Amino acid sequence: KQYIISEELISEGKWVKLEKTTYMDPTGKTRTWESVKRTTRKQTADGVAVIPVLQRTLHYECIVLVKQFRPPMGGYCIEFPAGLIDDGETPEAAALRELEEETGYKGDIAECSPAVCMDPGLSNCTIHIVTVTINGDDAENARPKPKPGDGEFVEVISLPKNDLLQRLDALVAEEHLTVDARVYSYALALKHAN
Amino acid sequence: KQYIISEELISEGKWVKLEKTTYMDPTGKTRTWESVKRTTRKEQTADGVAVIPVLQRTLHYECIVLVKQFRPPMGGYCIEFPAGLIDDGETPEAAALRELEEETGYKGDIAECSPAVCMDPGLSNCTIHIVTVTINGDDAENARPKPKPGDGEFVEVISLPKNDLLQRLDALVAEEHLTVDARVYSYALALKHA
Ligand SMILES: [Cl-]
Ligand SMILES: [Mg+2]
Ligand SMILES: [Mg+2]
Ligand SMILES: [Mg+2]
Ligand SMILES: [Mg+2]
Questions:
Q1: Residue B37 touches chain A, beta carbons under 8 Å
Q2: Positions modified as Phosphotyrosine (chain A)?
Q3: Is B80 within 8 Å of chain A by CB?
Q4: Are B8 and B19 in contact (CB under 8 A)?
């Protein structure tokens, strides 16, 4: 019933553009929206986010997360490991690659979502969420070496899956960090499944 | 270690702006980023709220109440938690209950309220509170709920059982050409992983 009529470029940077979207509302009235898009999409989606489940015998299972300075936020954020999918890369391959670059861990694919939207009232950005298990007892994950690209500076924070929400809330209270909404949503549902 | 040096306006619309952000990297080198922000944020602790609405009825399985709407940035329909921006002077909790009633017709009870969490921190400064709300679906006020959408708001309600959320979302994606929100999908995935 609703659809896009036209998209006007307002401003195009190197990485991001701002458009004015004209669309038909369901009453038959024409309306406008200010929309953000990335300039980098080619792909199934802009990026991947990895849910990395660190499995070590006789330990609690952990979810592996990353802490980095985020210039749009003006501060440090706790997130799932994540990055843009390279042209001609599969989401699964982007997931293992980003996980290794950002954390040093080598994981196995468990499942892969369809393309899911990041903030659909604002942008067209999408990701695949890729669940990955990490056999923490294997020798390649003994001393994981993060291989960060240029300008990436990532700290690794592993938190137990069974208390994830309480651990994140503690980090916020004590560290003045911002937790990512996807991370927080995941943590909430671990608690709510009960 | 890292911090913002300057934020230069590139382009400002009615609702969204783009900025050139200069920051200090942990090596001591100046770098730039292209940053998106909303123009609507005042003294709110976040831009918006998203509501996790747990519909509870005797002799029924718990349902998660979701909304489907056309999203001009996406050029299509999206399935999301009920959500909206926080009005000036409004608490996150009040915003939540208000947006839930407006979008779904249901009158909820606050359960929990998250700290401000980031929507897409590599791109934007946008933040929300995630507000968990229970809905007593045996209460007569919640018998035949009618959405009171605002001007230019056109929302469908979709209530799915919590105990099968991920499969039910996958079945909707399989039938109809729509995008699930990343927070919804992350919450559904944790329900499975628990
Ligand atoms: Cl798993
Ligand atoms: Mg990354
Ligand atoms: Mg990376
Ligand atoms: Mg809304
Ligand atoms: Mg609304």
A1: yes
A2: 60
A3: yes
A4: yes
Cα A98 to ligand 2 centre (Å): 7
SS (H, E, C) chain A: CCEEEEEEEEEECCCEEEEEEEEECCCCCEEEEEEEEECCCCCCCCEEEEEEEEECCCCCCEEEEEEEEECCCCEEEEECCEEECCCCCCHHHHHHHHHHHHHCCCCEEEEECCCEECCCCCECCEEEEEEEEEECCCHHHCCCCCCCCCCCCCEEEEEEHHHHHHHHHHHHHHHCCEEEHHHHHHHHHHHHCC
* A77 vs B: CB within 8 A: yes
Report helix, strand or coil for B93.
helix
Q: Please name the method used to determine this structure.
A: X-ray
Cα distance between the two ends of chain B: 37
A178 min Cα distance to partner chain B (Å): 6
- List the CATH code of the domain at A1-194: 3.90.79.10
